């Protein structure tokens, strides 16, 4: 009942990203394969969206293009370590209804103090590498 795909996105020179609270770093579009008609992007708020989330990095999956009115999808995000291995993930508890231009994600994906702590190895060589797995419900 689902078609599963994944995507990685490396944000080089992460410490040079000057985005403040409410601002966004956006990935290029991606899809499940060359024949896929859907287009998706990731959007990261490195200092959250508002005062109550400013201590988190927020991460969203955005449906950029789809042929019909809606797409239902489950999704999971993780950060890759220096070996390109998944660390902790955060995964949606169900499929969510996307329409063109709609996002779903986690406002509190990771605490900034955890992300920035050298002990955790999440910014190797000043790169933030995000990994997204999506399970698209087939219509």
């Amino acid at each position: 009942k689902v078609v599963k795909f994944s995507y990685m996105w490396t944000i080089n020179n992460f410490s040079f990203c000057r985005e403040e609270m409410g601002e966004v770093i956006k990935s290029s579009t991606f899809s499940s394969g060359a024949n896929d008609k859907l287009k998706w992007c990731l959007r990261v708020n490195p200092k959250g969206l508002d005062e109550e989330s400013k201590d988190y990095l927020s991460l969203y999956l955005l449906l950029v293009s789809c042929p019909k009115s809606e797409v239902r999808a489950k999704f999971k995000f993780s950060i890759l370590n220096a070996k390109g291995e998944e660390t902790k993930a955060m995964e949606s508890q169900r499929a969510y209804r996307f329409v063109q231009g709609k996002d779903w994600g986690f406002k509190k994906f990771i605490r900034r103090d955890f992300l920035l702590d050298e002990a955790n190895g999440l910014l190797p060589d000043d790169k933030l590498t995000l990994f997204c797995e999506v399970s698209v419900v087939q219509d």
């Binding site: 969203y60 998944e86 993930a89 995964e91 949606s92 996002d103 779903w104 994600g105 986690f106």
Partner: peptide, 12 residues
């Protein structure tokens, strides 16, 4: 790895 299963939110 560990996966924390959570409700999603939207910015709209």
């Amino acid at each position: 790895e560990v996966s924390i299963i959570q409700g999603a939110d939207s910015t709209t």
